[PDB]
Nucleic acid binder design. Structure first.
Ligand SMILES: [Ca+2]
Ligand SMILES: [Ca+2]
Ligand SMILES: [Ca+2]
Ligand SMILES: [Ca+2]
Lengths: 312, 312
DNA sequence: CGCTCCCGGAGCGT
DNA sequence: CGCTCCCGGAGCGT
């Protein structure tokens, strides 16, 4: 097999970038910055399978990809990850008095990783003939540093430099300026854990605010640079409706609840890989403002287009 | 049985408060404000049995309660919660291809509630014959309302007012001034979810800051009211070291890692219910300043004393 | 029904 | 090893 790089020693992206990330998800070759995905092959193939048929039915790839992105939850629910993992990991509890198992650990991790893998793969495909607007899992080295706050912490005589790298699960960014970027935080479910996305959104704002940085003893490399860095959330909202005594989803309902709304309110945008929901917008316009606390995931192609001035 | 109140209709706490809290947890009588705890009996008895033995051994009761507080993780690990719940709840996966069971859900909820239940019970004991310094689960009605931010969120011609009630798992407060209080957030495990505590810590800071309030368009009843409200965190850090391929604890180690430090650095104090950890301080003086990022939980006796000017 | 609980290693990054 | 992933109802409060 072969193994390549995505970035050089100065942090610059190599040429033909997107095809390298897509080839990595395809298990075509290795990469310095990413391990092969452990359990991505089945669900990736089904994504392709679903979208090779659609575009064969005449439909333009752009539309097929918008629709697919907005249906990733169906895709994830259709993949029996449990059965695939069972042949490898112990289904019995890690501890004598515990409830988690290696299998449930693997399941939890992999379904989360596959959610991100999926929309990294999708964006890679829709951008595979563009070398101006790149997409990668995690953050490109320049944006990671830029999005890293520093907090000097003195306790008595002890001094501790605390490093605070603001979270991004994946990123689409400008080659000529990696700060010109859409930073995406993803979670397969919201619940109160959505709150985690919210401190990062809070830190993202703070990195731009000189008063706030001074208040908390925070330092940034540059607040100006981050002006073009947008911070969004994407979710699959996967609560299986057919659960015994299921209490329902956090987005697929008539209107999102109060404390769900607030987490969404501190992000620039929030997406759900679902399509039939009333309060969820299917239309996105950066210029005339946020249409709704929630957008269909397919709308991310629209802000990619509107921000970086391209067509897909 | 008999059923009583913790707060009068105006919000003021009834006399002889703290033994109404202890009796509720003893399931001597009912309360308006709290359901009786679902499965606290077994571990509550072990707590009592443990300190009566330590006291009978000749140890001063203050020293005994402090020691128990700093060993609550041992108590929780010694209670076979899973066995007690296996009679009632079903171990099969909630969903065909899922990984969670109604039993596991019960385990997770109840082990979290018991951790809080424990140190509420402990503090109610420690404060048995004090009616100026009170302890309750959750927040007293006036501190609760005082810690509730609001956010006007206009999208387009919609408008929704967003409530943001800053979290407290349990609270120790002055009868004469409920905003003279220690608010405590608790978690059995840290991991990355400690991050949730951190946004709430940020919100509690924000509620005292006019610039920050205005920045994110937030309203509070009174910033100056919260000047004596302190915001701390307590953790049991229960990662069982006997789990196969265990990665160990977040505070029981030579040095808390960077991002665990970060979360801790945004709280006034962080406690662990473990003793004998090198970096974890066993001394607490408000006057001379935070001794370290982490304290033994028994040191909460010490800040209660210093802050409210009482002897326990 | 709103909101919160999480007896934790797998997996990936450095 | 640092940090993050979580096919979600039970339980408590209202
Ligand atoms: Ca994420
Ligand atoms: Ca009295
Ligand atoms: Ca009795
Ligand atoms: Ca808590």
């Amino acid at each position: 097999m072969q193994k390549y790089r995505l970035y050089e020693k100065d942090g610059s992206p190599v040429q033909d970038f997107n095809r390298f990330v897509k080839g990595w998800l395809d298990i075509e070759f290795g990469l310095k910055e990413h391990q092969p995905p452990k359990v991505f092959d089945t669900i990736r193939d089904k994504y392709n399978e679903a979208i090779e048929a659609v575009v064969l039915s005449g439909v333009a790839p752009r539309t097929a990809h918008k629709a697919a992105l907005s249906t990733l939850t169906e895709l994830l629910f259709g993949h029996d990850l449990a059965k695939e993992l069972s042949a490898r990991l112990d289904i019995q509890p890690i501890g004598v008095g515990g409830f988690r198992s290696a299998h449930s650990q693997a399941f939890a991790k992999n379904v989360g990783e596959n959610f991100v893998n999926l929309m990294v793969y999708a964006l890679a495909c829709i951008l595979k003939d563009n070398d101006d607007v790149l997409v990668d899992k995690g953050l490109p080295p320049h944006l990671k540093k830029a999005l890293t706050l520093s907090r000097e912490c003195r306790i008595k005589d002890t001094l501790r430099e605390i490093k605070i790298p603001i979270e991004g699960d994946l990123c689409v960014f400008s080659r000529s300026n990696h700060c010109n970027a859409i930073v995406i935080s993803a979670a397969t479910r919201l619940k109160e854990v959505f709150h985690i996305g919210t401190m990062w959104a809070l830190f993202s704002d703070v990195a731009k605010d000189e008063y706030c940085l001074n208040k908390w003893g925070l330092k940034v490399e540059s607040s100006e640079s981050l002006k073009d860095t947008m911070y969004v959330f994407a979710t699959a909202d996967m609560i299986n409706k057919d659960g015994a005594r299921s209490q329902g989803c956090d987005v697929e309902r008539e209107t999102p609840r109060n404390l769900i709304a607030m987490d969404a309110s501190f992000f620039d945008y929030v997406f759900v890989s679902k399509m039939g929901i009333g309060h969820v917008s299917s239309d996105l316009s950066l210029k005339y403002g946020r249409e709704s606390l929630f957008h269909e995931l397919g709308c991310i192609i629209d802000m990619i287009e509107q921000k970086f001035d391209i067509l897909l």
